[PDB]
Amino acid sequence: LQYGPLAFVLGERTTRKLTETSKVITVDGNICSGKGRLAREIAEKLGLRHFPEAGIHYADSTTGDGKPLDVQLSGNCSLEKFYDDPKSNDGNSYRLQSWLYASRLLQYADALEHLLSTGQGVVLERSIYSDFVFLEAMYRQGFIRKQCVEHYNEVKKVTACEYLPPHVVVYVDVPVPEIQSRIQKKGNPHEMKITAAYLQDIENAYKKTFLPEMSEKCEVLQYSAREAEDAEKVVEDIEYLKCDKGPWPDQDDRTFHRLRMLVQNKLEVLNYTTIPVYLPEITIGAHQSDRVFQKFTELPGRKYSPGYNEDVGDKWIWLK
Amino acid sequence: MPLVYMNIIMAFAIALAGLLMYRSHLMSSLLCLEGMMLSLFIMSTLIILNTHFTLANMMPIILLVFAACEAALGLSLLVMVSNTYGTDYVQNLNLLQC
């Protein structure tokens, strides 16, 4: 039976599935750090589910098949164009920022739903609570205007207030010159165009706003490049923590029921992302909207409900 | 009608006007509602006793019971209003317009 008010009425509760090992873990670091491998190792050692960083096409991997869709149908933005031409006049930078924030919101909703329904913990690679560092980096470098950051702030205020912050925040601290050296050694032709001021602004926003704010609600475990390879040590520090300061121990069964009803039904999760605020970067005309929607509808498995598509081989349609 | 009935009716009318005037506070209007209820109770019991309607004697008591509910209800709302504004003033209840 799909979870709902009736399933909550008799039997199923949420607090009886938490086994003290929920520990929503968020790993944060500057561009081109070891945060991804650290997150994978933490998830493996602690037995939690690893959530890779939400990219442009994260939502494509949750619906239909995992194959990503065309950039025109999903995203309508690219990271390579942002790196090559950050000051473009088509509004690519803020469009990408808003799409990435929405993808991170969807991923956080998915992780919370999994944790509430199963009880096994999740390890994210970046949360919606730390997505604003890139926004501040773009704004300080002149990549985006002020109205874009105002719209982002409005969307964040109306969206992120409905969820619970991660139990413990893990930060990987890497100096800017080391980041530049790793970027140069990596080899991707587009990432070599990332200026030092961008990374410096990212790390300044991190250390000045994100960590001080998270210290008031969670436990922050800052690390370094050298100590980020021995994942056993960080696992021991995580498992020898005192989780008593956040709002998580202050949640009752009704609050968990409301949160579980909210995290599923992703339409309510993404409702406030498309507020009727008309910014030239994100607003799309009626004709292009109609053309792109018609193109999306003609996809092999997107015309009907996920179970009523004869194109992808569904059978017994006339009796479902 | 004797003067007692008209005095009770005048008391009810005065309480209704006082409720409808809404000076500054909210507790005053709740007091006006309770006064209207008291006037209704007195009128009803006088009418019942005068005509010797025996079964109707429990009618006023039920009245009083629901009065309490109304009072409780109002007080509850007042508390919330205070917790939102720090003051039970009716001037603050203006977020919604026509």
């Binding site: 009907y304 409900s305 009523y308 004869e310 349609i317 006339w318 009796l319 479902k320 | -």
Partner: protein
């Protein structure tokens, strides 16, 4: 309301036994056909809302829609016919019971009725 208060009226019957003396509507009544059409339209709208192949998503659901609409429509038509028959019966009874208020007037022919003529010019 005129028929709300009537002697010998059971409150919540919806179909008094006296209504059984009237001919039941035929199963091929056009109003029943329209009720079935309404059920079919409701089923099609249900298919459209859920993003399903509108014409042939669910045959059992559409069949249930049509059957429920026809089932309700049969009894609705029965009650409507009973109510109209009762109104006609009461009107005729009251007309018969008060002959002075509904007199039989004279039957004049147009040869003696004088109607003024209006030329068109």
């Amino acid at each position: 309301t005129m028929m709300s208060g009537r002697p010998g009226r059971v409150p919540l019957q919806f179909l008094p036994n006296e209504a059984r003396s009237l001919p039941p509507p035929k199963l091929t009544d056009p109003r029943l056909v329209y009720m079935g059409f309404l059920g079919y339209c409701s089923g099609l709208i249900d298919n459209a809302i859920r993003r399903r192949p509108v014409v042939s998503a669910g045959l059992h659901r559409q069949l249930l829609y049509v059957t429920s609409f026809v089932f309700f429509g049969y009894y609705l038509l029965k009650r409507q016919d009973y109510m109209y028959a009762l109104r006609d019966h009461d009107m005729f009874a009251y007309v018969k019971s008060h002959p002075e208020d509904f007199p039989e007037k004279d039957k004049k022919t147009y040869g003696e009725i004088l109607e003024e003529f209006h030329p068109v010019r």
